Design a protein around this ligand. Structure first.
Ligand SMILES: [Mg+2]
Ligand SMILES: [Mg+2]
Ligand SMILES: [Mg+2]
Ligand SMILES: [Mg+2]
Ligand SMILES: [Mn+2]
Ligand SMILES: [Mn+2]
Ligand SMILES: [Mn+2]
Ligand SMILES: [Mn+2]
Lengths: 386, 386, 386, 386
């Protein structure tokens, strides 16, 4: 029942199931996982692929010989399991050298080192077959107002992404970039805090068609925002290159709960949106098994990520296929929302007396929207009450 | 001391000082103000101009004769006082007909009526000399997930703004549009919730150069966002057409407190940003005198808006002019943040061994940012402790 | 399917279904309801009773003759339908005279008038058979720090409730008081913001056994708090006299959505808690049908309140009755949580070497909590996936 | 200027200035501090004393010989500097054994070990002369609803504190307990989330007079609550045994910024409250120097904690001493708030026709509160504009 298959495009970061359980007030509760182990267990659970930071796969400071050995180890695990590597990313946040950021660090030499660290992992990602390269600028920001001129930081961020886009085109690489927004933590405020801010920044890049967003469920909910609404605007702009699925209980620290947890109804409306729009990218889970769990609970949490998506997918499909729902959507004039407001043109609208001079404003105002019956129908479908 | 002059570009909405004090749980505590009265008292306080919704100046449903009479009344008050009208806007949120929105209402005929209501107030705004026309889509949104397909709503929102831009260019009007974002209230979630979302939406319009943002202090703080950071990104994109100043105490209902209230330090960093960047638009206060006040408290609150800006302007100017601060900014490498990361080019950065192979990552990591001394210097300057 | 009966103890405020749809940015979208009408339609839907503010039933300023007429009208509707009146309350927030509060208004004469308004509605509530009298101090608070000395306000709040408790005991009335907390709105900060603050204040009253709490789902979620946790502490103290059920989407304005909306999983854990603990009070819905609805949507929303509780009640009962869940609860040591930590006493614990000197801290640390499998089992039960 | 002296009662935790800068997404940026070093540098800065977790002073797992050596080292540093130890606490949150809590862990044997770990540090705290013992139950809580029965957990929490109170009285120790609330992080929801919840729980203990609260500025602001209001209720109940001062920027992760940062106006109203009420306990700073700082920035941040309190103390004292402010306080009827509402008694209030039958409700409603002029006067005083 609700069994994931590799064709479901479910992917996991090595840092997700491999999280040793270390939070700001406690030490690790689980031993480190061999990346080869994680690929094997995730393949057994029905996952389609894995993703990685450079430091997840190759320990920081490894020589060129150990690096090659670590990649050959990893490559063999992908060959033996049939697991893909659809996206890769850079760790520009863990080492103390990135404490003021990577691409927008105040120190110029740290910025230049951040670009070199990203570039050689882009080579590795392409060699592993990744189609998307994600950038989470978790250290780009500030705790105080004077520590960062945001206009200058935005110049340095545009410079870095323009240089990366110049690298991939000059190399012929078939890879696109996905900015992952986050409003805060670990910095007090992070640059490009939401999906909207990231989408606007992309329009100022040299080659905007190379860049999209990788939104995370919990990150937009850390700002109290409606995540399905943000995804819809990302899809509307044609910039949903990638997605991060997890759960979050409102505005607080980044929980990274398994998908389906947190705001359950928002997860239902997101799956309904992703499936109706025909999203064909990876279903990526950027989550953390709670440090209360042993390794059996780690794999149970990862399986719950995939199970919860499949249950919600079934409930959303039954919701849209219901003739009572389809009739209710017409009763709320969802069909009129899709119709153009003034396809007849500006001049016709200006001479249309039925639009103003002879508009019965009270008859229109008295028309109920019937949203509550429609929403209860969605609730019945989500809960399996019909 | 800290006396505003009309050259300070301080402006107020008629709906601000004219707010009768009616909240969702109580009736009005103040009588309605004659718009002529509001223009006279605000001019006496040192304000530079006023702004208005169409329904603030002309009562809804007024005939073409009373409309002209109401405008002639208003025009005479501007002539007798020297008060400008730099921005105007439309009330597409009060009447019950807009309960599901205006530009993105599900009913098509309400959308068409919303455009006609906006267009004829654009004519009046141009006749009154307004340079900016603001759109706050307070009713564009939903309380439930199925009530609104956001992709379709974004098509209807783009259609409306494209038609308005087509009207003003075909008429030769010298006026620009400023979208005012708000994350929620009165709707459960409002479309284009933050400055970033509005900036990204503008890049998909037919003539993006006609559209900017009118951010409000409290609205971005309703999402826990750093308002000075959002303004900097709006300035970075060259889209800060207008600004709304007020105060807000964190994530809750839209308080619309007087400017300087709420987050005082964030107000200091905003004034510092607005003045250093050379912002030359109106300093507009979209605030509400608390309903506990009589009319004497209304004018005291409005005066406090202008006083608080002038105090913060002086403290920010003394902050930047301090040689100890200038030396501290260099100690934190703010000068290096403004320097290009790789002006030598991609190829030079790739062959630069000092950027990676020979980068002393521990020496760079051990370099303190000295942000705390810089921030305490800003705190001393704000508090007048130096 | 999921049909409410009067024995389900479902109750509604007259102000809930009777909300005309007036928010801070719009006018009413529905006509006023006759209280007799509301009693009839709610009885047809399966509700058990209604509740009321004094101003909901008797218009403010009504003479002693119209007052009696309004009550006789209402009494006849209760007799014809079999509808109870389990709780009543006072409107100390709508009239402009309460703009600085009622029990803790700065003006003494307004405080004294607030007590007289409450007392004569206590008489009416007893005559109508109410067992609980609710106090929501929505206007007790401040927007600025100097406007209210909170220690003095807490003295005035204790004085008011002590006087009310002195009235009901001297009259022999069989009625108890329930304080309904709310963190903010309409005031910037409201006194006694959460369930905890109200519970602590009750312990300082003259006769604490006369006072309990009436928590609301959305109000505690306006502070980001876990509502099931707060109810458990209220039950733990034996002070859950009454409950307000609705929905809320995180930290924002008081949405008052229908129950089941907002945080669906938190609604499931609340119903599970209320039923397992044997809560026998009224299931009261303090909600607002969205102003987008006509009167048909009003009754659909009210029916959804009752339906959603019954669905969640069934899913929670199936959850606790599942042997796999019962075995999982033991695997997570929920049975050990209920066992006393040191029933052997302090001296025995001090001499117990197995508790410290010989405690294998690493063997205990390596024991997984198995919380994720338990939570996924709860998720399957909520979604009807088992 | 604004120089702290030991008589200012300023104290710091060893874990504050000693924080190595390790957050959930990065490694340490500073070496560990010798506790002897921290006592020396803090004494040079003008601090009055230090506080400690048991694991801050004695490394976890130390033998009885190294333990005594570590204490003798520490004792010598206190003797050479004149530094006090006013409060101590237990680390029941760092070791993996506490991953499900200490006093309310599901496993009984972990609960018993948590009590033994606390008890022997109570002995050490008394030997070092601490008057207050703080308990922060950072691990008492849950991430999911079924993982913890809160009623059972509250029984286990009451059992633990009753046993600790039984230990200190049976030993003749002169020490009191202060519960430090926190709404969340590291757990999804923490038991006793706010000051109110902790105050209510104390009233159910066996000897409530032994227990108070140790509120933290940022923790109550993590729930959007007004911290000065919470302190006033703690003072009103006579339970402000201790206080934690820091800064926090709204609802997000626990920032632990230096005091004065975050919400500056709320810091002003807190100092004004603490000084007017005559609070004589330690001024304790539970803060974290940002990991961007080296050790020079650590001591600059700690000095800023003390400086900011002294500046705010001066501005608040000048505020209350201003005759214009005193006259404004009377204009807003703050003197009437302190007057009893019905000192004449219930019977007199019932027969007082001027309180109801003859109360001019419109004349009272028309009286302005004059709160805005009072607040602007406070703003001028805070900013040094008068
Ligand atoms: Mg992510
Ligand atoms: Mg505005
Ligand atoms: Mg309620
Ligand atoms: Mg603390
Ligand atoms: Mn995350
Ligand atoms: Mn606003
Ligand atoms: Mn409510
Ligand atoms: Mn903290």
């Amino acid at each position: 029942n609700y069994q994931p298959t590799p064709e479901d495009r479910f992917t996991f970061g090595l840092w997700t199931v491999g999280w040793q359980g270390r939070d700001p007030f406690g030490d690790a509760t689980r031993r480190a996982l061999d990346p080869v182990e994680s690929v094997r267990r995730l393949a057994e659970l029905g996952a389609h692929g894995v993703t990685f930071h450079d430091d997840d796969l190759i320990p920081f400071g490894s020589s060129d010989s150990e690096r090659e050995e670590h990649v050959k180890r990893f490559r063999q695990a992908l060959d033996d399991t049939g697991m893909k590597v659809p996206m890769a990313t850079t760790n520009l946040f863990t080492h103390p050298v990135f404490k003021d950021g990577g691409f927008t660090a105040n120190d110029r030499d740290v910025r230049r080192y951040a670009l070199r660290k990203t570039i050689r992992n882009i080579d590795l990602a392409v060699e592993l077959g990744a189609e998307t390269y994600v950038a989470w600028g978790g250290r780009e920001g500030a705790e105080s107002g004077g520590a960062k001129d945001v206009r200058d930081a935005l110049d340095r961020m545009k410079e870095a992404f323009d240089l990366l886009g110049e690298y991939v085109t000059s190399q012929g690489y078939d890879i696109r970039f996905a900015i992952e927004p986050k409003p805060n933590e670990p910095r007090g405020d992070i640059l490009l805090p939401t999906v909207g801010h990231a989408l606007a920044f992309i329009e100022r890049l040299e080659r905007p068609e190379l860049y999209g967003v990788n939104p995370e469920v919990g990150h937009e909910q850390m700002a109290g925002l409606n995540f399905p609404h943000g995804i819809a605007q990302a899809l509307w702009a044609g910039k949903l290159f990638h997605i991060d699925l997890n759960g979050q209980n409102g505005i607080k620290y980044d929980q990274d709960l398994r998908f389906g947890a947190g705001d359950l109804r928002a997860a239902f409306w997101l799956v309904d949106l992703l499936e109706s729009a025909g999203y064909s990218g990876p279903r990526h889970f950027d989550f953390k098994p709670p440090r209360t769990e042993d390794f059996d609970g780690v794999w149970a949490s990862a399986a719950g990520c995939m199970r919860n998506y499949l249950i919600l997918k079934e409930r959303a499909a039954a919701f849209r296929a219901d003739p009572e729902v389809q009739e209710a959507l017409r009763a709320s004039r969802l069909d009129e929302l899709a119709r153009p407001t003034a396809a007849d043109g500006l001049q016709a609208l200006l001479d249309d007396r039925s639009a103003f001079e002879e508009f019965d404003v009270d008859a229109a105002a008295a028309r109920g929207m019937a949203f509550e019956r429609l929403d209860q129908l969605a609730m019945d479908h989500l809960l399996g009450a019909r």
